[PDB]
């Protein structure tokens, strides 16, 4: 039998290939094709800002954070052009409510990231990864860390659990009218999304490239693997939250939390 956990995703990707494609009648064609890559290429190029090595850095640009926020904002268009391209009021309203909770829960990540980039004081990721040399930026900002976790798992990562189903009747999940390779494009997109959120968490909150007694790139890789396993553990443990409870614990609870977080870091930094 297959001994590797990743081999299942490999077989899934192989399976999605070479599947006959049917044309949908009474549907738009340009957005039916373009909506997958707005979800895929966005988090693919979100991988372009990781400091995997000082000598093998994929991009030595001065700003990577703003690019990440630009991808976070862009991601909604995939669910929206998918909703309009569904051309079925059921699926359209399902993608409208999914994009609703998406835009609702995408607010927090920028303001939560302001704390760490303020105690870091720079946008070049070499400065952040060199800042966590002796003390990591996780001890004071517990609330910011959990807020960034919730925001990262809330962007169409299935934690809301309203993507393939709908609590409200008269409407249906928007993953029904896609049955070709686009469904595999969605899965691979959320896969690169979760691994990139984990990588950004380790290299921006914790200390990347430390190397206490072993080479630091495998130290980063193993820490990323442990946080991957913990993310999967809590994703599985996390039960489906109905739409209402998600709306209740959205703008009410974490906007004040991040605002007092900025107040605390600004008061203690000087």
Partner 1 sequence: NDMVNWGRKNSIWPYNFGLSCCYVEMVTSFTAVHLRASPRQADLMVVAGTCFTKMAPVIQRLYDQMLEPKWVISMGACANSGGMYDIYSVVQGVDKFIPVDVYIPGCPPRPEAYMQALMLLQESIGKEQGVYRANMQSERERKRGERIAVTNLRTPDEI
Partner 2 sequence: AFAIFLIVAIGLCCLMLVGGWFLGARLRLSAKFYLVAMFFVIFDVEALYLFAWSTSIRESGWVGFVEAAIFIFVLLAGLVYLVRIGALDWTP
Partner 3 sequence: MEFAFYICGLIAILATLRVITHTNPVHALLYLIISLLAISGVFFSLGAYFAGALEIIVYAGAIMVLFVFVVMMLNLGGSEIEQERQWLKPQVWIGPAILSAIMLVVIVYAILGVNDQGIDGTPISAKAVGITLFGPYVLAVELASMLLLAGLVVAFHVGREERA
- Name the residues that contact partner 3, by CB under 8 A: 28, 30-31, 34, 62-63, 66-67, 69-70, 72-74, 76-77, 80-81, 83-84, 92, 96, 103, 110, 121-123
Contact 203, 125 (CB under 8 A): yes
Q: Which residues contact 192 (CB under 8 A, 6 or more apart)?
A: 40, 43, 44, 46, 47
* Residue 144 binds to partner 1 (criterion: CB under 8 A): no
Q: Rounded to an integer, what distance in angstroms lies between the CA atom of residue 240 and that of residue 162?
A: 8
Residue 62 Cβ, how far from partner 3 at the closest point, in Å?
6
Q: Which does 45 bind (CB under 5 to 8 A by kind): partner 2, partner 3, partner 1, none?
A: partner 2
Residue 202 Cβ, how far from partner 3 at the closest point, in Å?
23
What's the start-to-end Cα distance of the chain, in Å?
59
Q: Which of residues 158-177 bind partner 1 (CB under 8 A)?
A: 161, 164-165, 173, 175-177
Q: Which of 9, 10, 71 is nearest to 37 (CA)?
A: 71
Stretch that binds partner 2, among 23-31, 194-202, 230-238, 261-269 (CB under 8 A): 261-269
Q: Which does 4 bind (CB under 5 to 8 A by kind): partner 3, partner 1, partner 2, none?
A: none
* Residue 60 binds to partner 1 (criterion: CB under 8 A): no
Q: Rounded to an integer, what distance in angstroms lies between the CA atom of residue 190 and that of residue 174?
A: 16
Q: Which of residues 208-247 bind partner 2 (CB under 8 A)?
A: 244, 247
The shares of helix, strand and coil residues in the chain, as percent rounded to the nearest 5, are 65, 0, 35
């Amino acid at each position: 039998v297959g001994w590797g956990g990743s081999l299942q995703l490999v077989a899934d990707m192989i399976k999605m290939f070479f599947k006959e494609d049917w044309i949908p009648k009474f549907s738009d064609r340009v957005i039916f094709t373009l909506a997958p890559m707005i979800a895929f290429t966005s988090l693919l190029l979100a991988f372009a800002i990781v400091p995997v090595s000082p000598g093998w850095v994929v991009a030595d640009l001065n700003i990577g954070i703003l690019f990440f926020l630009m991808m976070a904002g862009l991601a909604v268009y995939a669910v929206l052009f998918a909703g309009w391209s569904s051309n079925n009021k059921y699926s359209l309203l399902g993608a409208m409510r999914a994009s609703a909770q998406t835009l609702s829960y995408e607010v927090f990540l920028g303001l939560s990231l302001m704390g760490v980039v303020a105690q870091a004081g720079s946008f070049n990721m070499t400065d952040i990864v060199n800042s966590q040399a002796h003390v990591w930026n996780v001890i004071p900002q517990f609330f910011g860390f959990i807020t960034f976790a919730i925001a990262g798992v809330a962007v169409c990562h299935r934690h809301p659990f309203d993507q393939p189903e709908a609590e409200q009747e008269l409407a249906d999940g928007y993953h029904i009218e896609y049955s070709g390779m686009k469904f595999g494009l969605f899965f691979v997109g959320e896969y690169i999304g979760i691994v990139t959120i984990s990588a950004l968490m380790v290299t921006l909150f914790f200390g990347g490239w430390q190397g206490p007694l072993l080479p630091p790139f495998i130290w980063f890789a193993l820490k990323t693997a442990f946080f991957m396993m913990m993310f999967i553990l809590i994703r599985a443990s996390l039960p489906r939250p109905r739409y209402d409870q998600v709306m209740s614990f959205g703008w009410k609870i974490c906007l004040p939390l991040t605002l007092i977080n900025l107040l605390v870091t600004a008061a203690v930094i000087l």
